[PDB]
RNA sequence: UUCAACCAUCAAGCCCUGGGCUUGUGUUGGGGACCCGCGGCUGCUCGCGGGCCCUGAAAAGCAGUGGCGGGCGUGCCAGCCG
C-alpha cells in the first residue's frame, strides 16, 4: 500500500526537479573529478536517467572518473542530486586502480591482475602497464577516454555495514549538492 | 491577532480551579 | 466479485489507518513441554 | 522628450481641483493619503514575463516621507547585526521610520502560513529587501505580497562590494552610512512594474501635494520609464494618463502612430 | 452495480489527478475522476471528484479518508447522494486540463502586422474612443489637444 | 549535557554580573508529570492534552477524558505510555499536555487541535458512552451459530 | 552490552546519546585499530623477543599481503592503511640498519631476507596487481591473525626503534601521503661493503618498473638519490628525467 | 609482462591449515532458518470498517 | 513502507576607479464593491493588465483554447510549443 503522502511528496519532488532542470537548459553556459552514485529521489527524469546510463553510473556506490569539459560539467550540473563528485587526489587514483581495478574485455568484468590485459586492449595508445594507465588517468592524457572506458566502474563498499544498531545506513547522505573538492577523497578513502 | 492563537487559546466557559495563589 | 471488491477496499483501508505490519511470527513448537531457556551464568 | 509639461501642470492643477470636489461633497484627510497615478500604455508588451522585483525611479520630490509610514526591511542573516546597526548607529528619523527588522531565515520560519503573511502585509507600508534573498521572497511571502504591485519588496543593496559565510562571524556588509543613504533612496524612490502588459502605473505623489511637485515627478518619471525600461523607446509609447484611484485619466500625451513600425504596415 | 461518486476538497498542492487515481484505485477501480481548475491558469481549486465503479467502495474510501490530515489539510472526503449527482459533473474527466497562455496569445495578437484596411478600422476607433474621453473630460474643466491619426 | 551547558553559560554571566535572563531564553516544552498536567488541566493552562492507553492502574487516568470534557481542553488517547516517555526522555509517561509553543510552530498546533477535534473526538464522540467487552469466545460463538441455524430450520 | 545499550538509544531517537555511547565501542572502522586489545596476549605469546623475531617471517607475509587488499568489513580500510603504515616503518628500520639481505623474484612474489639480531626473517610480498580473495580461504579467520599480527609488528618496532636509538612512532605527513609519498612520507629523527653498494649512484626509476621494492632495495643498499617519473609520488630525489645527475636509470619498455 | 602464478592469500590460508593451527572448514552460504508461522495481530484482525 | 532540508545569504558582465548599471523568472484558491488602460465583438459583452477591501492553507457541476511528436480520427501522454 501507497500512502497518500507519499504520493504528495513525488509530486512536488518532481515539479523541483522539473524547474531546476528548466533554469539549467535556459542557462546554459580541464580536470580531473571522481563521480560516485548515491541515492536520491527513486523517480529520475528521462534526461538524467539518458546521463546517468551514459556514465555508467546506474548502480548505487558506482564510482567513475570524469574529464572535465563543458558537455561533461552541464551533464554533471544536471545529474548532481544523485552524484557526489570532487577531485580525486593521486593517492585516491592510485589505490582505486590498485585495489578495484578492473578492465571490459569482450564485454566482460576482468581484474587487472597483469600487465598484459592492459598491453592486449590499451596497447595501441602506449599504455602498455598499469601504471601507464595510472599515469593517462591521472594527467588527463589524450587517450583519457579510452583509458577510461577500459576501466570497469568501481564498486565501492559501505562501512556502515561493519557496524549491526547502523546497518542499513547509507554511508553518504543526500542534500550535500555541489563540488566537494578535494573532500571527495575522504569519501574514496572510506569506502576503498 | 490570528486564528490559530485563537483556536489555541480556546477553553470552556467554567473558570478555572486553583488549588491555592501563585506567585 | 462484489465480496473480492469489498476486502479490497477493507484490506486498504486498514493499510489507510493502522499500516501495514499486520503479521507477526510465533515459534513452531514441536512439544508441549515448556523448557526454561539457558542464560548465561 | 514629446510631452509638453505645461499641458501636465494643467492636467495636474485639474486633476487635484477634481479630487477636491469629489471629497468636498475628514475632508482633509480624505484629500490626503490619495495617491496619483500615472499610467503608461504602450503598443506591444513592456517585457516578456513577469518580473518581481521593481525599479527604482529617484524624484526631485520624494516619496513616503510622512512620518506615519513603516517601513519593514528584510536583510540576510544575521538579523541581530542589522538590528543592533538601527538601535545603534542609524539617524533618529529612520529608526522611527523603521518598524521591523527581520532576515530571511526567520521569515521562512514565521511567515510560512498565508494568514501570517496578510499579518505582516496589513502591519506594514513599505518592505526593502537586500538583494542578496530578494529572488526567493516570491516563495516566501506568496501570492499575498504579489498579487499586488502596491507593496512589492523594493530591492535595496546591503552587500560588501568586492566557501559558505557563516553569519555569526561576518555579516558581508557595506557600511552603515552606505546602508542608510541606500534605505533613504529606496523608501524615496517611485517604482516600476514589469508585467507582460500594455498597461504600466507608476505612484507619483498625492493629492495633498502642488500641481508643480507632481507635473515634475511626472516628468522625470516619463523621462527614466520610457529611456530604461520601455523597448523601442519613445517608438513603443502609445498614450500617458494621470489619474487618481477613483477619477478618469487625463491625458498628458497621445500619439499619431498606431503602430510600431513600417514592418507592421503589409500589404 | 450503482457507481459511487465522492466529493474531496482541501486538496493539498500535489494531490491531482494521477495521485488521486493512483491512490483510491488501491481502493477500488475508478470509473472517472476529475479535479476541479481554473481555466485562466490552469491551477487547481483543492477540489474533485471521484466516481468510482462500486458505491460502498466509495463510501469505505470515504470513511477512512475523511478528516485525513494531509500536508497542513485536514480533508474533506464525502459521498454525495445519486439525486444530486450533476447529469454534467464528469464532463472533461480523464484528460489533460492544458495551462493555455491567452496572455502570451494576447502579446502576440498585438505583435503581427496586419493591412491597411485594419489600420484604416483601428484609426476610425481610436478616433471615436478619443471623442468619447474628450467630452468625458469637458466636465471636469480639462482640455486635451489631441494630434490627428496619420492614416496609412 | 543540554542542562550543563546552560548552567555554565549562567554561572559566566553571573561571574561579569549579569543576570541569566540575559543569556537563557524562555523554555518551550511538552509538559508531563500526571499532577503537573492535572494541575494545568484545572488551571487551563493546557492546549493540548495526549492520554496513554494502557496506565496500569486504570484509575490514575480514568478521570482525565471527563476532566479535560469540563475544561474544555482538546484531548486524545494515544496507543503508548513508552512512545510518550521517548518524547519526555523517561521509560514511561502517562500523559504529555502542550500548553504553549514557539511562533513558528503555533500554526502547526492550531492545525493539529484542529485535526484531533474533527478526526478523533467528533468520530468518538458516541462510542465513548457504550459498554466494552461482552465478546464470546471461538466455540461458544460458533455453538450460538449452529444453536440458532437449528431453531430456524426446525 | 555496550551494543544493546547503542541500539536502545537508537530507538529511542536519542541521537546524541548513541553517538556518544558509540565512541566506547573503539570500531576499527573508525580507530584504524583491533577492536580488542590483545597487548596482555602478545607477551604471554612470546616470552622473548628472540621468539617474537623467530614468528616474524609469519607476520610479514600476512601483514605485507593484507596491506594490498580491498577494504571488507572483516578489515575496514583504516585497518589496512594501519598495516601499510606499520611495514613502512618496519622498512625504514631495515633501511637505516642496513639489515636487508637477500631478495628473490618469484613468479609468486618478491622473497625478502632480512638478518635482525642475529635471526633470519624471510618474508614474501606480492606483486601489485588486483589480489583476488577467493571462497576457499577462511577470509574473517585471516582478519583475526591480521589484528594479532599488527599488534605484534608495532610492538616490534618499538623495540627496534628504540633499541638503536630513534624516536617511535616516525612523523608521517598526511598531505606527503595524499600525493602519494608511501616510504618518502616519513621522517625518522633522533631519541631527544655491501651497505655501500650504491652509495654513489644517482637512480632514475621509470614509469614501468615496480617503484617500492626498487626503492626498498636501493635505500636499503646505499642509494641516497633516487627520482622517479612524477605519478610514481611524492619525495623522489628528481623528477625531470633530462637531469644530468643521473647515473643509472631502470627500465622495462620495448 | 610477468605473469603472477598462485594465491598468496591461499597459501598462507593453506599453511595455517598444514602447521596446524586451524582445521580446514568449508564455506556455509545458507544457514537453516528457524521454523516460524506466520499469523496476523488481533489488532489487525479486530479492525472493522 | 521517512509529509525534513536543499534557488544566488551572491555570481557573471559593462563603465574603467566610480560604486553604480544589466542579467540570473521565482506567486494558494476563492469572494465583494469599484475607477481605468488596451485588444476583439455591429455593439452589449468577452479577453489581457493594473487600482481598493475580505479570508484558518477557507473550497460542492458549469471544462475553456490550437498544433508538433509519442500512444491506441481519438474527454490518451508523469512530453513540449502556441
Redesign the interface.
Known amino acids: 500500500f501507497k500512502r497518500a503522502e507519499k504520493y504528495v511528496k513525488e509530486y512536488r519532488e518532481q515539479e523541483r526537479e522539473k524547474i531546476r532542470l528548466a533554469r539549467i537548459a535556459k542557462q546554459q553556459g580541464a580536470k580531473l573529478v571522481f563521480v560516485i552514485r548515491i541515492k536520491g529521489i527513486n523517480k529520475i527524469p528521462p534526461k538524467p536517467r539518458k546521463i546517468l546510463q551514459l556514465l555508467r553510473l546506474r548502480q548505487i556506490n558506482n564510482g567513475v572518473f570524469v574529464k572535465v569539459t563543458k558537455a561533461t560539467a552541464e551533464m554533471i550540473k544536471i545529474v548532481e542530486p544523485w552524484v557526489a563528485y570532487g577531485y580525486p587526489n593521486l593517492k585516491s587514483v592510485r589505490e582505486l586502480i590498485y585495489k578495484r581495478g578492473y578492465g571490459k574485455v569482450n564485454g566482460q568484468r576482468i581484474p587487472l591482475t597483469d600487465n598484459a590485459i592492459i598491453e592486449e586492449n590499451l596497447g595501441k595508445y602506449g599504455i602498455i602497464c598499469i601504471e601507464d594507465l595510472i599515469h593517462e588517468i591521472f594527467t588527463v592524457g589524450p587517450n583519457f577516454k579510452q583509458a577510461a572506458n577500459f576501466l570497469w566502474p568501481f564498486k565501492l563498499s559501505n562501512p556502515n555495514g561493519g557496524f549491526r544498531p547502523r546497518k542499513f545506513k547509507h554511508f553518504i547522505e543526500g542534500g550535500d549538492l555541489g563540488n566537494r573538492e578535494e573532500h571527495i577523497n575522504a569519501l574514496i578513502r572510506a569506502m576503498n | 491577532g490570528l486564528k490559530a492563537d485563537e483556536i489555541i487559546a480556546q477553553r470552556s466557559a467554567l473558570p478555572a480551579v486553583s488549588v491555592r495563589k501563585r506567585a | 466479485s462484489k465480496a473480492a471488491k469489498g476486502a479490497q477496499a477493507k484490506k486498504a483501508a486498514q493499510a489507510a489507518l493502522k499500516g501495514v505490519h499486520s503479521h507477526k511470527k510465533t515459534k513452531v513448537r514441536k512439544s508441549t513441554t515448556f523448557h526454561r531457556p539457558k542464560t548465561l551464568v | 522628450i514629446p510631452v509638453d509639461p505645461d ?1 501636465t501642470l ?2 495636474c492643477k ?2 487635484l ?2 479630487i477636491k470636489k469629489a471629497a468636498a461633497a475628514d475632508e482633509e484627510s480624505t484629500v490626503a493619503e490619495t495617491p496619483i497615478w500615472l499610467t503608461l500604455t504602450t ?3 513592456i517585457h516578456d514575463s513577469h518580473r518581481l522585483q521593481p525599479g527604482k525611479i529617484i524624484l526631485p520630490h520624494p516619496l513616503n516621507t510622512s512620518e506615519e509610514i513603516s517601513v519593514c526591511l528584510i536583510t540576510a542573516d544575521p538579523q541581530r547585526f542589522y538590528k543592533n546597526a538601527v538601535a545603534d548607529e542609524f539617524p533618529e528619523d529612520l529608526r522611527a521610520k523603521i518598524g521591523r527588522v527581520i532576515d530571511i531565515s526567520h521569515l521562512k ?2 511567515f ?2 498565508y ?2 503573511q496578510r ?1 505582516l502585509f496589513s502591519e506594514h507600508d513599505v518592505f526593502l529587501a537586500d538583494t542578496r534573498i530578494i529572488n526567493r521572497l516570491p516563495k516566501a511571502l506568496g501570492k499575498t505580497f504579489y498579487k499586488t504591485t502596491t507593496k512589492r519588496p523594493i530591492p535595496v543593496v546591503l552587500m560588501a562590494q568586492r566557501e559558505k559565510r557563516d553569519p555569526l562571524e561576518n555579516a558581508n556588509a557595506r557600511p552603515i552610512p552606505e546602508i542608510v543613504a541606500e534605505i533613504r533612496k529606496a523608501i524615496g524612490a517611485a517604482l516600476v512594474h514589469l508585467s ?1 502588459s ?1 498597461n504600466t502605473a507608476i505612484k507619483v505623489g498625492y493629492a495633498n501635494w502642488e500641481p508643480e511637485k507632481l507635473a515634475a515627478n511626472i516628468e522625470t518619471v516619463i523621462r527614466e520609464l520610457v529611456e530604461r525600461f520601455v523597448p523601442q523607446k519613445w517608438q513603443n509609447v502609445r498614450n500617458f494618463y494621470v489619474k487618481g484611484p477613483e477619477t ?5 500625451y ?6 510600431l513600425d513600417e ?5 | 452495480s450503482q457507481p459511487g461518486v465522492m466529493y474531496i476538497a482541501r486538496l493539498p498542492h500535489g494531490f491531482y489527478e494521477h495521485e488521486l487515481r493512483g491512490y483510491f484505485s488501491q481502493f477500488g477501480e475508478i470509473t472517472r475522476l476529475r479535479v476541479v481548475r481554473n481555466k485562466k491558469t490552469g491551477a487547481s481549486r483543492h477540489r474533485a471528484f471521484i466516481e468510482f465503479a462500486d458505491a460502498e467502495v466509495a463510501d469505505i474510501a470515504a470513511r477512512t479518508m475523511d478528516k485525513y490530515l494531509l500536508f497542513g489539510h485536514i480533508l474533506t472526503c464525502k459521498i454525495v447522494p445519486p439525486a444530486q449527482v450533476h447529469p454534467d459533473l464528469f464532463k472533461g474527466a480523464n484528460r489533460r486540463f492544458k495551462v493555455v497562455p491567452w496572455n502570451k496569445m494576447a502579446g502576440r495578437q498585438l505583435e503581427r502586422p496586419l493591412s491597411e484596411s485594419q489600420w484604416q478600422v483601428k484609426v476610425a476607433k481610436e478616433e471615436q474612443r478619443r471623442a468619447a474621453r474628450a467630452e468625458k473630460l469637458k466636465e471636469m474643466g480639462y482640455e486635451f489637444e489631441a494630434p490627428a491619426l496619420k492614416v496609412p | 549535557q543540554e542542562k550543563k551547558e546552560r548552567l555554565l553559560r549562567e554561572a559566566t554571566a553571573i561571574k561579569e554580573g549579569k543576570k541569566k535572563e540575559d543569556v537563557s531564553k524562555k523554555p518551550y516544552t511538552v509538559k508531563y508529570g500526571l499532577n503537573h498536567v492535572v494541575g494545568l488541566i484545572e488551571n487551563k493552562k493546557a492546549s493540548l492534552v495526549l492520554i496513554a492507553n494502557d496506565v496500569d492502574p486504570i484509575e490514575l487516568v480514568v478521570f482525565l477524558p471527563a476532566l479535560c470534557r469540563k475544561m474544555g481542553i482538546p484531548y486524545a488517547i494515544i496507543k503508548g505510555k513508552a512512545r510518550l516517555g521517548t518524547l519526555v526522555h523517561k521509560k514511561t509517561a502517562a500523559v504529555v499536555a502542550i500548553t504553549e509553543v514557539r511562533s513558528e510552530d503555533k500554526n502547526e498546533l492550531a492545525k493539529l487541535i484542529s485535526a484531533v477535534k474533527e478526526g478523533y473526538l467528533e468520530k468518538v464522540e458516541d462510542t465513548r458512552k457504550r459498554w466494552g467487552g461482552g465478546i464470546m469466545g471461538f466455540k461458544a460463538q460458533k455453538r450460538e451459530e449452529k444453536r440458532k441455524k437449528s431453531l430456524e430450520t426446525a | 552490552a555496550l551494543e544493546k545499550k547503542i541500539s536502545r538509544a537508537l530507538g529511542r531517537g536519542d541521537v546524541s546519546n548513541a553517538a556518544r555511547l558509540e565512541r566506547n565501542a573503539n570500531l576499527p572502522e573508525k580507530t584504524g585499530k583491533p577492536r580488542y586489545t590483545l597487548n596482555h596476549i602478545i607477551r604471554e605469546r612470546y616470552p622473548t623477543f628472540q621468539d617474537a623475531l623467530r614468528d616474524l617471517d609469519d607476520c610479514l607475509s600476512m601483514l605485507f599481503l593484507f596491506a594490498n587488499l580491498p577494504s571488507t568489513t572483516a578489515v575496514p580500510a583504516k585497518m589496512i592503511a594501519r598495516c601499510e603504515r606499520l611495514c613502512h616503518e618496519f622498512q625504514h628500520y631495515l633501511i637505516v640498519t642496513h639489515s636487508l639481505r637477500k631478495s628473490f623474484l618469484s613468479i609468486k612474489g618478491i622473497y625478502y631476507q632480512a638478518n635482525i639480531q642475529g635471526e633470519d626473517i624471510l618474508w614474501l610480498v606480492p606483486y601489485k596487481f588486483n589480489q583476488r580473495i577467493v571462497g576457499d580461504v577462511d577470509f574473517r579467520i585471516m582478519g583475526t591473525f591480521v589484528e594479532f599480527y599488527m599488534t605484534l609488528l608495532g610492538f616490534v618496532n618499538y623495540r627496534l626503534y628504540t633499541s638503536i636509538g630513534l624516536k617511535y612512532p616516525p612523523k608521517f605527513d598526511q598531505v606527503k601521503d595524499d600525493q602519494g609519498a608511501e616510504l618518502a612520507a616519513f621522517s625518522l629523527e633522533g631519541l631527544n661493503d655491501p651497505s655501500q653498494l650504491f652509495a654513489n649512484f644517482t637512480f632514475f626509476l621509470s614509469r614501468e618498473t615496480p617503484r617500492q621494492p626498487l626503492e626498498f632495495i636501493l635505500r636499503a643498499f646505499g642509494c641516497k638519490r633516487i627520482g622517479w617519473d612524477a605519478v610514481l609520488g611524492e619525495g623522489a630525489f628528481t623528477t625531470d628525467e633530462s637531469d644530468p645527475r643521473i647515473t643509472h636509470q631502470i627500465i622495462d619498455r620495448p | 609482462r610477468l605473469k603472477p602464478e598462485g594465491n598468496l592469500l591461499k597459501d598462507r590460508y593453506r599453511s595455517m591449515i598444514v602447521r596446524g593451527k586451524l582445521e580446514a572448514r568449508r564455506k556455509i552460504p545458507f544457514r537453516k532458518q528457524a521454523k516460524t508461522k506466520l499469523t496476523e495481530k488481533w489488532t489487525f484482525k479486530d479492525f472493522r470498517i
Open positions: 499641458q494643467k492636467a485639474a486633476l481641483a477634481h503598443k506591444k508588451h520560519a514565521k510560512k502560513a494568514e501570517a499579518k507582460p500594455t478618469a485619466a487625463l491625458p498628458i497621445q500619439t499619431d502612430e498606431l503602430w514592418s507592421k504596415v503589409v500589404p
